[PDB]
Amino acid sequence: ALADISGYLDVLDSVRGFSYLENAREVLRSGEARCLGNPRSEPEYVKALYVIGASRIPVGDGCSHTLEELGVFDISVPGEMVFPSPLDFFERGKPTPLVRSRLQLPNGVRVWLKLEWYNPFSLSVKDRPAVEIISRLSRRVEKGSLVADATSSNFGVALSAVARLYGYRARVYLPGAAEEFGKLLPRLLGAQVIVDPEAPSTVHLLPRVMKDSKNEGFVHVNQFYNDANFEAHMRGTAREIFVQSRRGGLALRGVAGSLGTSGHMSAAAFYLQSVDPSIRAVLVQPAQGDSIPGIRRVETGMLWINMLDISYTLAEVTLEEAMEAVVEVARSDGLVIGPSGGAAVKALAKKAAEGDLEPGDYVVVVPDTGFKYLSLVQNALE
Amino acid sequence: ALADISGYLDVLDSVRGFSYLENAREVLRSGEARCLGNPRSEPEYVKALYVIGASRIPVGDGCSHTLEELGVFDISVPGEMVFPSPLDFFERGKPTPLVRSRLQLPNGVRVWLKLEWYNPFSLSVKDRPAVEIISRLSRRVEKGSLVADATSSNFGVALSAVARLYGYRARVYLPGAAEEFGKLLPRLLGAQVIVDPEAPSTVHLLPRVMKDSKNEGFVHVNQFYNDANFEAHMRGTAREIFVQSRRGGLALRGVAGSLGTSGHMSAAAFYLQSVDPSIRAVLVQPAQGDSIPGIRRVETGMLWINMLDISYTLAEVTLEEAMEAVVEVARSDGLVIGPSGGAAVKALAKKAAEGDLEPGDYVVVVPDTGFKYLSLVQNALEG
Ligand SMILES: *Cc1c(COP(=O)(O)O)cnc(C)c1O
Ligand SMILES: *Cc1c(COP(=O)(O)O)cnc(C)c1O
């Protein structure tokens, strides 16, 4: 039988560790889940179901229910696109668009672009971890409390908007080289902003944020380590790629993406490889020396991409090469993508040139809009 | 009986003038269109149906069909949000979102925000006129031809993107006061940009564009005069406000917005007042001396708002007041609207205070995202 999962989400408070993902993987591979005589007594299984996108759980003895029956494939979006609040629109105005590009790559590699700027608060992929993180402290941490993090531009904006929505205050710490929109827009949204001119990277701010947290008593949400980040992308970004590829008739042979926190691509890889382990994940490595906003090299410390059982391929991409792809996609599709989106397109283009990819449909996650990066666009047209 | 309108759309090539809108208004008012014996002999009636958003026409002798049967309400975004091309995404990734605000206005005036930054190319309301203009010359004008116009930032970006999707080249003329994204992003999109530092406004550039058009032989698409702008907003923005209000359970009592070309608010007013003449159109007048990007005062010259049978009220709004609404919406809703969106919100707030408006639901058209306007945001926070 079917019950609403909403009544069992306290298991998100109490399940720890990655062992529950064995259940997620097996439910996805088999396309079904076994009924729980006592759902309460199997919290890891309930969490597995939530993380893959189920809105319902199977209840009883001996029965089983399909992904479909569990609500994994339920249509979210009202046909008329009317929403009673911005949060409801974040939650139900999904999937984010998946749009076939007319970019021509060698070897039958067809490019689709997933447009994560379609998230309303930060115009970026970062809404999803912000919502998930804030919503799940929202029972134990007191309203009016300060939450904070080290961030590049997008999550600081996401965090500021979402914290306030849920009744919290936000503080955002950014390196000197962050874009001005990351420094300014959080203030518009009601947050405090701290820029460290000296910090050479976003993760270099983390020790200061942790020290300040101990002295000042604010909640350090730590997107780089907070599993709700990964889980948000499992139930959202990754579930969407899966459902979109199926209902859209793609022959999904891989995904391509970039890595900051590693949240969105680790989820994409893990989810899709659960259904079909041969699906490739092609991932961007900002070339040494270069800085591409929002993203980093794997060696500098990433949680999910390293700890989870996922196969991926790297590809080196310079800032110059990423911006060339931004120009190519703009001239080809009339779509203005961000530097990191361009990096992911280029990575896919390289692996396509090398003959490494089966012909078929490949989904590139585009983290944000290129409108935000006028100085990088200016340099790229020279 | 019904026939697909696709087989009758050469009327768009041949019909001229505004007389056809009489038919559009009556069909919307009665909520039904009557069958045509020979549709080919009634091209104005066919155009009327295309412009209000019908996908089918009524065919027969004596019969009639509702807006619903005609496909006017058949604008559903697909549940899976998968689009086999960018143009298909522009076409089918609609309606743009209509989101209830928590802004508190006096006298029972409830605010809904229509987010036109959800257009795919220029992230603005201007994609819609760009696509309709270019698609409808995409037959008669030879590929590789140059298309051009005088513009503020948004339509320059939209024109540039759309031109390339239909196999044209683009040139964009902007005044010196235009935003940097307007000067730069068309070049990313492959277009030529001409900036006139001295030009005090966008419409001041028009004589020079027209002169250059005569000399160099490019198509001046002229958004300020081209009826496909109005028509795009009739079948897009306006039809969406109508259909979204109905299906969404709103008690629609008015729309608020701003004027550049006057394309989108003239359409919203004309379409909705066709259905119900008591629906108000509250329009922004940028206070004398001030410049709100993308928008103008009625007196400086406008086509559809003056020629069409619509009612509206004007509210004066300073740049400062427009930006105060941007701050307020950001703090209330967590959404960042543009200066002209903020102005429309303020125009609605002002009218609401004056006791002028029926209590109920009001849709504010938000032309773009305020993410772009960082200097104006900076200045606004200093207060
Ligand atoms: C956060 C972000 C990324 C990387 O996303 P994660 O899910 O942190 O790995 C890439 N690009 C941009 C612009 C971002 O904001
Ligand atoms: C075009 C535009 C307007 C006005 O729209 P029209 O349909 O030209 O009257 C308002 N604001 C912005 C930002 C625009 O680009």
From Swiss-Prot, chain A:
Q: Does the keyword Transmembrane helix apply?
A: no
Instruction: Give the E.C. number(s).
Output: 4.2.1.22, 2.5.1.47, 2.5.1.65
Q: What is catalyzed by this enzyme? A: O-acetyl-L-serine + hydrogen sulfide = L-cysteine + acetate; O-phospho-L-serine + hydrogen sulfide + H(+) = L-cysteine + phosphate; L-homocysteine + L-serine = L,L-cystathionine + H2O
Family (UniProt): Belongs to the cysteine synthase/cystathionine beta-synthase family.
Its job: Cysteine synthase that can also catalyze the synthesis of S-sulfo-L-cysteine from thiosulfate and O(3)-acetyl-L-serine, as well as the sulfhydrylation of L-serine by sulfide.
Q: How does it assemble?
A: Homodimer.
What is this protein's record name? Answer: Protein CysO
Species annotation: Aeropyrum pernix (strain ATCC 700893 / DSM 11879 / JCM 9820 / NBRC 100138 / K1)
